[PDB]
Design an enzyme around this catalytic site. Sequence first.
Site, mmCIF file in Angstrom:
data_model
loop_
_atom_site.group_PDB
_atom_site.id
_atom_site.type_symbol
_atom_site.label_atom_id
_atom_site.label_comp_id
_atom_site.label_asym_id
_atom_site.label_seq_id
_atom_site.Cartn_x
_atom_site.Cartn_y
_atom_site.Cartn_z
ATOM 1 N N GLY A 97 51.627 -29.492 -5.439
ATOM 2 C CA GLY A 97 51.332 -30.174 -6.681
ATOM 3 C C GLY A 97 52.205 -29.673 -7.812
ATOM 4 O O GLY A 97 53.293 -29.149 -7.577
ATOM 5 N N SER A 98 51.716 -29.808 -9.040
ATOM 6 C CA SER A 98 52.531 -29.588 -10.212
ATOM 7 C C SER A 98 52.983 -28.133 -10.405
ATOM 8 O O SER A 98 53.909 -27.915 -11.232
ATOM 9 C CB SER A 98 51.769 -30.111 -11.416
ATOM 10 O OG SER A 98 51.875 -31.535 -11.477
ATOM 11 N N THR A 99 52.390 -27.174 -9.699
ATOM 12 C CA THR A 99 52.849 -25.794 -9.807
ATOM 13 C C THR A 99 54.272 -25.701 -9.277
ATOM 14 O O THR A 99 55.053 -24.850 -9.701
ATOM 15 C CB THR A 99 51.951 -24.809 -9.031
ATOM 16 O OG1 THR A 99 52.052 -25.069 -7.626
ATOM 17 C CG2 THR A 99 50.501 -24.947 -9.468
ATOM 18 N N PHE A 100 54.603 -26.604 -8.352
ATOM 19 C CA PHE A 100 55.917 -26.613 -7.724
ATOM 20 C C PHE A 100 57.036 -26.970 -8.693
ATOM 21 O O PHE A 100 58.209 -26.785 -8.348
ATOM 22 C CB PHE A 100 55.913 -27.586 -6.543
ATOM 23 C CG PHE A 100 57.062 -27.399 -5.595
ATOM 24 C CD1 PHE A 100 57.097 -26.315 -4.734
ATOM 25 C CD2 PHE A 100 58.100 -28.317 -5.552
ATOM 26 C CE1 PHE A 100 58.152 -26.143 -3.858
ATOM 27 C CE2 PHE A 100 59.158 -28.149 -4.674
ATOM 28 C CZ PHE A 100 59.184 -27.060 -3.828
ATOM 29 N N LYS A 101 56.713 -27.468 -9.890
ATOM 30 C CA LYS A 101 57.754 -27.780 -10.863
ATOM 31 C C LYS A 101 58.528 -26.535 -11.277
ATOM 32 O O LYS A 101 59.679 -26.641 -11.715
ATOM 33 C CB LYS A 101 57.146 -28.452 -12.093
ATOM 34 C CG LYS A 101 56.494 -29.793 -11.816
ATOM 35 C CD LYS A 101 55.736 -30.297 -13.040
ATOM 36 C CE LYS A 101 55.058 -31.626 -12.755
ATOM 37 N NZ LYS A 101 54.188 -32.064 -13.878
#
Length: 640
Positions: free
Chosen positions: A383-387
């Site tokens: 999810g967005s942590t991967f940004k």
Amino acid sequence: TQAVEAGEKTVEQFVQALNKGDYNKAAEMTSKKAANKSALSEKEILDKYQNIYGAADVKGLQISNLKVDKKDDSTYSFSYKAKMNTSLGELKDLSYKGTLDRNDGQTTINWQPNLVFPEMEGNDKVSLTTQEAARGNIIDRNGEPLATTGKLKQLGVVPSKLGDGGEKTANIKAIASSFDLTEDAINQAISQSWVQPDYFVPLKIIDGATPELPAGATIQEVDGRYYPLGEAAAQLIGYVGDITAEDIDKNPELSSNGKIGRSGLEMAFDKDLRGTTGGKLSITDADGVEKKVLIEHEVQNGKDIKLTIDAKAQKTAFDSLGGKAGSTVATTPKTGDLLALASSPSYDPNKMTNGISQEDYKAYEENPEQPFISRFATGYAPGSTFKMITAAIGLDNGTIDPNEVLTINGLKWQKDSSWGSYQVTAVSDVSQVDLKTALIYSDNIYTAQETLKMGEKKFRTGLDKFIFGEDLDLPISMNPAQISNEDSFNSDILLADTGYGQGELLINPIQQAAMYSVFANNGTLVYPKLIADKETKDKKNVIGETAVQTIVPDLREVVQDVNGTAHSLSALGIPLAAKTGTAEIKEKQDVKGKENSFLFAFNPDNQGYMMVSMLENKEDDDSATKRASELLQYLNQNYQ
Ligand SMILES: *C(=O)[C@@H](NC(=O)Cc1ccccc1)[C@@H]1N[C@@H](C(=O)O)C(C)(C)S1
């Protein structure tokens, strides 16, 4: 010569039938019961091989250095070295002797007692005394016990020694009143299908002083495995179960009366924890007097296992999940020590190993939230942590300018008309979005555009510097993280989804803690470590130190900026850098999509702790962020 070749085949098949555990097929390859021939008949050879090899758990008989020649007209001698596995150890360097026989066309073995063990004569017996080895403990980094063995007094009633008419009702009431148990439950157990008059029906587990025993009750002390943290570490630690006859057939070095690890570290480190069985395997004369010893070891207890786990952090991490589906991984990111590996929901390992009813076991197995799963080892879309990874890659290869402000009109965006009805969506309507803004508000459109601008080649070039595809050196069954299904996205849409943590990404929480560790080590990836004494292993230059010094100040703002997605954690008043994420999943029932909440958080001042928490199939207004307050306080105070 043509006969000497047939004899080496007979000795080969005789040994093979013994090795294959078929003592009857080997018996039929012998000669007739006579002098200068076979000492026993075939049924007596079967029963001698079955009794003796069965008592020693003899398994895996293999021979070597076969020497077969000729001694007379119908007599051929044979010799060979041999070795075999027993419940005591390896029985090697066995000099076997014997004689063959060619009466008709076939060659038989003149069977003798020296073909069970080399020096057996006539009516010699075999004796085996064994001493069970104490299973080792499992402990945390500070010495606290995680899995230990001990004795447990077990109350139980004998149905025959209970009474006949009225007296049985009186003894039940006295046992019920003196042990705090309902009278309706004592009768429900002693009346089960398996119970017989003279059996021992267990009742309670005395955890203190043994009180007065009425007529019929009797305490039977038994060995038990205790788990202090209980369900808070059940997935990681695992549980032990009673050793079965199949287990002994696979590994004879086990104790048929001991416990065997069934899952988790109890099974992973089963050999080190279980020890080695001691005792002696001797050959006695016809009266039971010991002659020659074949094996003799002393009992060696199992080794203890010291983990990087912190018992307090492990229990706090688990409790913070409130029994909902989720998992938490806490490390010291500079060394990789796994401080906590929690998964929820869980099962009772004490109940699992110290007697569990078949109804409760089906509950654990029919539970849709699946408490047996080790969720810290299950692959998920990050999810967005991967940004953070995508941003660091875009900064390294010169694609993302931190101060450049992209203009994003509306909440929807697609590259061109070829995407059809698919569009990347943003939660906050921010028109002017730079890198710092995109991490605070967690803007997917900025990440999607910068990923497509970066190109697939440069995106994977940065991704390949991480641990995708690698097998971590951990005693946890685990699948390696993957970028996608194949080596190519072959889709601008999939490339975009992978940019902000969706797509075909699969990374388990432990693998996320390893990948995100770069932000606590100036771009060096520190591998996770569960055994406290192992050496710290790392992988340098995964991302540039420039990217770390650019992104971490922004991750502070994810907590500190009032519109930051982790602003509820600023109430802690501690140095925090974080990144939240909510991944949407449509791989269960099409009735409604399910969401997974994520939280990455570490201390950007001292790099003492790092946290990756998750909530699987989250409820509404429920997130990993609102639950992490307590564990962060503990890690901040105790791991500076
Ligand atoms: C990253 O995971 C982003 N998530 C989505 O675009 C999917 C989504 C899930 C639920 C509601 C709306 C959209 C962004 N990051 C999360 C987060 O950081 O919690 C947001 C809810 C801000 S969207």
